[PDB]
Amino acid sequence: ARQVTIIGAGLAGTLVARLLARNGWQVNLFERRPDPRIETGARGRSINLALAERGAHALRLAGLEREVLAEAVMMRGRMVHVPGTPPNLQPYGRDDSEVIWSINRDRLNRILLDGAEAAGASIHFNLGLDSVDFARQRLTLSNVSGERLEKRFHLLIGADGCNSAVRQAMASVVDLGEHLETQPHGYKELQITPEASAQFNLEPNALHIWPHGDYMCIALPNLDRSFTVTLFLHHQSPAAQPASPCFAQLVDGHAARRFFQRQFPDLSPMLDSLEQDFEHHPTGKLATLRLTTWHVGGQAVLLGDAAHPMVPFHGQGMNCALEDAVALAEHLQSAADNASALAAFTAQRQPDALAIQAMALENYVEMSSKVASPTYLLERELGQIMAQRQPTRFIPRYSMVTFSRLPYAQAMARGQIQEQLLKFAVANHSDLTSINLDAVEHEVTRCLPPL
């Protein structure tokens, strides 16, 4: 009676499992990793994520928001660390009282798994999808230890991440028209201990950034006052500058230390285990991957990172994946057949995914310049003034993405109109006093309707 098989008990897969099982679907969820709810003496290396209104609202629909927020650290603003000034807290939003939540990935995953099982989903861990035969609707799963399993499916949901095996298998039965846009930046995950964070008075209730042009660090807080730090830096040196910093040069921990002490002097002292973490934590790859479609008939569909890998510079990948899960469950529950459901899900979500993929790419330059043209600065100055005058019409794209549930595609479209307005108003002006705010405001209401 309405059967579904989900590959990937990650963020999207576990949430859609709950929503469907809730609705009376027979749900089986297969996961390559062990069950994180089985307590061990290990301590999780806390990947932590920014949870925004979008993501929170998706959890709210599933009745899990309260539980997740109880284990999330409130970030009331962005702490920018740049040389020559003390830490600069930029309160989020307008009233200076919007927030973003920092949630440990594993804690969130545990809560979602309990939610799925509570709803009736059956979860099987330590089983990795190897292949799919779409003519027989058969799956082949394996473990590096315990071995081989063949299973039929009725409907298959690929929630199996940026390297989706389901996506790989689908490419045969439909042209996905995939295009990968590789990212010159890699990333490295590092840690600040509770001890060091207190010693240097690092603010727990904020998102911290250390901008440095073509490379940067960010840090998100944990409940225990530790911070998870991410370094974004080129894999290799580029043609135009063959000796600029990159991972290729940082051949060991001592090299990494030299790099931090020079380029991030206030951060380095806080990274006690920099050498170890650097050598034992693998260097991550970033990329944007776009598909023309996310489903094969009514047989299988992709969502979350499986459907739309994006660069992490907007902190929205998880948020988008949770939104996807809600949308997929809604379509599966209102459709003439599964094929129509999957096509309608794709038509709804694919434009939104394209929009956040593009917006995330652009968000990099915003975070990490702190070298900005006076034109860019004047544009920002003007945009804040416009938001003040017309709070209902002019909403900074970042706020639309982060603090509202307006569809990504709409946020991009309005952001584009706002961008045009500002640039034409600011062009060939040295400063703000030459700008006629009245003329500019007139254009905001002309070109920008209320939501």
Ligand X SMILES: Cc1cc2nc3c(=O)[nH]c(=O)nc-3n(C[C@H](O)[C@H](O)[C@H](O)COP(=O)(O)OP(=O)(O)OC[C@H]3O[C@@H](n4cnc5c(N)ncnc54)[C@H](O)[C@@H]3O)c2cc1C
Ligand Y SMILES: Nc1ccccc1C(=O)C[C@H](N)C(=O)O
Position 323 contacts ligand X (CB under 6 A): no
Length of the chain, in residues? 451
- Cβ atoms of 313 and 401 closer than 8 Å: no
What, of ligand X, ligand Y, none, does residue 186 touch, CB below 5 to 8 Å by kind?
none
Residue 206: C-alpha distances to residues 87, 97, 98, 188, 388 (Å): 11, 12, 12, 21, 24
- Cβ atoms of 402 and 396 closer than 8 Å: no
Position 249 contacts ligand X (CB under 6 A): no
Q: Strand 72-75's sheet: what is its strand order?
A: 48-51, 100-104, 72-75
We find the least distance from the C-beta atom of residue 189 to ligand Y, in angstroms, to be: 11
For the CA atoms of 297, 301, 306, 312, the dihedral, rounded to the nearest 10 degrees, stands at: 110
We find the least distance from the C-beta atom of residue 36 to ligand X, in angstroms, to be: 9
We find the least distance from the C-beta atom of residue 209 to ligand Y, in angstroms, to be: 7
Residue 94: half-sphere exposure toward Cβ, Cα within 13 Å: 17
Is 205 labeled as ligand-binding? no
Position 312 contacts ligand Y (CB under 6 A): yes
Is 215 labeled as ligand-binding? no
Is 32 labeled as ligand-binding? yes
Position 304 contacts ligand X (CB under 6 A): yes
- Cβ atoms of 295 and 302 closer than 8 Å: yes
- Cβ atoms of 397 and 406 closer than 8 Å: no
Quickly tell me which residue has 């109880």 as its tokens.
70
- Cβ atoms of 335 and 344 closer than 8 Å: yes
How much is the CA Rg of the chain, to the nearest whole Å?
23
Position 99 contacts ligand X (CB under 6 A): no
Q: Which residues of 146-178 are buried (b: 16+ CB within 10 A; e: fewer)?
A: eeeeeeebebbbbbbbbebbbbbbbeeebebee
Position 215 contacts ligand Y (CB under 6 A): no
The span of 263-271, 297-305, 310-318, 347-355 binding ligand Y (CB under 6 A) equals 310-318
Question: Which lies closer to ligand X via its Cβ, residue 13 or residue 396?
Answer: 13
Report helix, strand or coil for 364: helix
Is 262 labeled as ligand-binding? no
Give the list of residues 6+ apart from residue 66 with CB closer than 8 angstroms, or none: none
Report the alpha-carbon distance of residue 307 to residue 305 in Å, rounded. Answer: 5
What, of ligand X, ligand Y, none, does residue 28 touch, CB below 5 to 8 Å by kind?
none
Position 363 contacts ligand X (CB under 6 A): no
Position 411 contacts ligand Y (CB under 6 A): no
Position 318 contacts ligand X (CB under 6 A): yes
* Per-residue contact flags (x/-) with ligand Y for residues 348 to 367, judged by CB under 6 A: ---------------x---x
Report helix, strand or coil for 138: strand
Residue 350: C-alpha distances to residues 1, 78, 99, 255, 374 (Å): 29, 30, 27, 42, 36
Q: Contacting ligand X (CB under 6 A), which of 22, 32, 167, 188? A: 32
Position 13 contacts ligand X (CB under 6 A): yes
Residue nearest to ligand X (CB): 10
Is 12 labeled as ligand-binding? yes
Is 363 labeled as ligand-binding? yes
Is 105 labeled as ligand-binding? yes
Q: Which residues share a beta bridge with 218?
A: 209, 230
What, of ligand Y, ligand X, none, does residue 129 touch, CB below 5 to 8 Å by kind?
ligand X
Position 107 contacts ligand X (CB under 6 A): no
* Per-residue contact flags (x/-) with ligand Y for residues 262 to 301, judged by CB under 6 A: ----------------------------------------
Position 129 contacts ligand X (CB under 6 A): yes
Question: Which lies closer to ligand X via its Cβ, residue 54 or residue 393?
Answer: 54
Position 105 contacts ligand Y (CB under 6 A): no
Residue ranges of alpha helices (H) inside 49-192 are 53-61, 65-69, 105-119, 165-170
Report the alpha-carbon distance of residue 42 to residue 377 in Å, rounded. Answer: 47
Question: Which lies closer to ligand Y via its Cβ, residue 164 or residue 316?
Answer: 316
Position 314 contacts ligand Y (CB under 6 A): yes
Q: Which residues bind ligand X (CB under 6 A)?
A: 7-13, 30-33, 49-50, 128-129, 159-161, 165, 187, 230, 304-306, 312, 315-319, 321
List binding-site positions. 11-12, 31-33, 50, 78, 92, 105, 129, 305, 318-319, 363, 398
List binding-site positions for FAD. 11-12, 31-33, 50, 105, 129, 305, 318-319
List binding-site positions for L-kynurenine. 78, 92, 363, 398
